[PDB]
Amino acid sequence: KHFFTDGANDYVTGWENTPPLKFPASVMKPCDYSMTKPIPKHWKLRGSGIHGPENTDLMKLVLWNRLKQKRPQREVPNINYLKDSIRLELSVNWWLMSCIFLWGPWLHWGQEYQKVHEQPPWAMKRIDGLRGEGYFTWFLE
């Protein structure tokens, strides 16, 4: 996508909130400890307890988000992604084709008809005696 979005289309830094799905959960998992079981009372708080790099998952997320920036080969995206990347480009190109091979031919026919019959082929011939081509978009009359 063209526009940059911190959450989804973050191409400036390449940050990703979660690790790749390819990695086993034992190797790397999304940072989610909402399901942690209640802490036993005899356990004592050693660390700060503050959300941050003391948590293993968050640490691995930061580490991977920096070490993923160098890779031996490309991670080929599927054709669906590639189509979306240039959706506007392809659509504009087809619009140009339509303007040349659809709009072009009937516009030429209308002008040639206008030459002989004074008004385009999609207009009501007048009887008022006024001269000239008149309107072109008949449905906006």
């Binding site: 009501m124 011939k125 005696g129």
Partner: protein, 100 residues
Amino acid sequence: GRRLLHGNYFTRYLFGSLAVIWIAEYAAACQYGIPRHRNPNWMWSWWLEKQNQIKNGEIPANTPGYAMVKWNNEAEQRWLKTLNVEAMNEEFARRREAYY
């Protein structure tokens, strides 16, 4: 890869809006009983009658409208001094002969 708008938002809201505008307009016309038949002509009745006379051959072809009114402005008086419909028709006739 996360989407913010409708998957087909551009076509959806463009063609969709046009459709709603067109349909709403038809409904509005029905409620007010507006005549929906397009007329491309002027409605000056006396003028349209003069035009029929030209089409019927009662008034000579290429006769100007100011050659038929009962009041002429100054600029049309200037034109009437140099108007020769008979000569104009002969010139057109000569052109047709040359073309064919």
